Amino acid sequence: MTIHPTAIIDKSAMIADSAIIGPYCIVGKNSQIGAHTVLRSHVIIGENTKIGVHNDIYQFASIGENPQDLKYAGEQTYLEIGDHNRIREACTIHRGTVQDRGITRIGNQNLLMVNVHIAHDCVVGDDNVLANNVGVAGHAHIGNHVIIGGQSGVHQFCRIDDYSMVGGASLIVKDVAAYVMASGNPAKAHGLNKEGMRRKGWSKDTIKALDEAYRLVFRSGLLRDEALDELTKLVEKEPKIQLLIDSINNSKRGLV
Amino acid sequence: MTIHPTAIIDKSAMIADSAIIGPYCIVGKNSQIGAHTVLRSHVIIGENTKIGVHNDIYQFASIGENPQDLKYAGEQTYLEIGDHNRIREACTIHRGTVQDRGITRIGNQNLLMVNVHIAHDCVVGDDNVLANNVGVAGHAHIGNHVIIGGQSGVHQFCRIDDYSMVGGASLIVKDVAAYVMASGNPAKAHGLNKEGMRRKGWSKDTIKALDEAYRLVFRSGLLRDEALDELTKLVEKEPKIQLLIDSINNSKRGLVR
Amino acid sequence: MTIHPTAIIDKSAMIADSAIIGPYCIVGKNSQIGAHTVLRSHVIIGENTKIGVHNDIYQFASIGENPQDLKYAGEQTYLEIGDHNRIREACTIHRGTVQDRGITRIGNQNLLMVNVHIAHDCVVGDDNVLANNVGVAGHAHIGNHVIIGGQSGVHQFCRIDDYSMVGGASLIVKDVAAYVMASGNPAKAHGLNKEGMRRKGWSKDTIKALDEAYRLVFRSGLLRDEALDELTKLVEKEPKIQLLIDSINNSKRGLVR
Question: Pick from B44, B45, B6: which is nearest to A26 by CA?
Answer without folding.
Answer: B6
